[PDB]
Amino acid sequence: SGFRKMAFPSGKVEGCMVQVTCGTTTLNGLWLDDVVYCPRHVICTSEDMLNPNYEDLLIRKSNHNFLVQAGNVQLRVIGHSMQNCVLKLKVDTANPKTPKYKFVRIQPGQTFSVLACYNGSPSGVYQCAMRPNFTIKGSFLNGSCGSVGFNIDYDCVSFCYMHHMELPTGVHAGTDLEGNFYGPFVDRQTAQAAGTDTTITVNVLAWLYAAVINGDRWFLNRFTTTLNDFNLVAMKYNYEPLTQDHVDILGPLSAQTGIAVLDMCASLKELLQNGMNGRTILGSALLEDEFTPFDVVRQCSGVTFQ
């Protein structure tokens, strides 16, 4: 028993990280087959990051302006192209450690692991959610750009996030691996504020189920609620509306615990209106919203990958 914020094992992605340097700018790239993917702003200069003309700047870049270092091996760039906000550097050698992989674009409310890297060297792994306002609350310093987010399904790595920038509120924004930003952001050092963030209601409910599974049951009551009456209360506390699709996705956790979804909603309604009365749930005084229902089932059943 026990419930932890758990990241995917990172070994398959560790073997894909490289250092990419252009001019005096260094960041990380992702080496899959004979292509290295990295944020296109590696080609900018300090003097240019206000509103870079990326297409123009790339014209004046040759293959040998890109230094790609994979551990002890320098990779030769034999071709370069730009796809939206990512650069694709074709290289001499196919990565022998390339896993089975897909590029996916995730929905807000979904979770993924981030492999934080610096100078092509992985330094940490942690679990994140795509916020409703398309930001992530990551932990990224200078040099972290090109770090990637991913999920693992059996033996296949689904890459969903590449890191590009930090917002003034200290949260983070990036692209999918096709270079398309999540949310209304652009890769320029301009004035950019994210929409108001909301709590991911279906994830909070999933985590209350995790708590019950792990013996923490004090918040269960004998009240009932309809979906509409729950959503009338939840919206006033800045929670996302709960849809019928969300209720369906909570079906398996409901069957396992014997607690109806709308009964769990009633317990959450009491927590919102009355507070915790000084208590915690799974050690938290705030309600956790970065576990999906799939995250809870997977962890509580010991699903394995590699």
Next chain:
Amino acid sequence: SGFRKMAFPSGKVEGCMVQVTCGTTTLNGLWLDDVVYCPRHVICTSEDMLNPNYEDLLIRKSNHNFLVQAGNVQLRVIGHSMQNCVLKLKVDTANPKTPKYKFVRIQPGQTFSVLACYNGSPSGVYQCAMRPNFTIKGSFLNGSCGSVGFNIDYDCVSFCYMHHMELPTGVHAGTDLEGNFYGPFVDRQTAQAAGTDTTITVNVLAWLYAAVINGDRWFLNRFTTTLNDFNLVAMKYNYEPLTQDHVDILGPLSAQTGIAVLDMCASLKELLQNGMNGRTILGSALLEDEFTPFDVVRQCSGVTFQ
């Protein structure tokens, strides 16, 4: 910016995990060079876990009673010995993926990453703290024994924990890699008194320093405190008493931020006595105690957000 509970990248440890089966009991083993390390209770059957004579069970076993599997490859056991609570199975093949490594025994309050494994395959990775009473608050199901905890310094893995059991309170206990239990515990299914679990004060202080480094000072104040006046408040709130040894460990964070250790203690004392009043620190409403001073320096910017 940002601050996340970050685990070490798990790839170096994933390459070491194997499955060990004896009779009908399967758990995880750690394959380093030509030795597989695993918990000695792999040789137990369900009916004799109340008072197993481990040197009763082991003399009855031959090398070929141990089935060791790495991937789809059987490893042939050519020798075995018991050291404290761990079994050492000599195998006929050195692990080609053995990293540089050490075995270290850590102190209460210190942290490590756990690669939770089932049947020799990894399920996930997360960061843990050794509690003051030598337990850990993990996520371990049936079959997780032999999962290990570790730190990585450059490319040397320091293994410090191997998982053995869950206590009746839902917390977890295990050994160092020489098989010595952390805490006054033994590998049998009998009631064993545990010390009381207090909050790791030096780690809370380190995390307040992290909040300052990242740009937040709202919780500071002008008082100072003596060590003893602080510890009187600490014990009211179930915090571990702070020693001069602990104060010395916070030296680097104190110097980096310009806040004397006993001034941060005065700040913590006021947070405990007055609560948070709806505010948060690094996103938390409860003070975090699973970051050591070293963890903070490893994750935070070397440049304080002044």
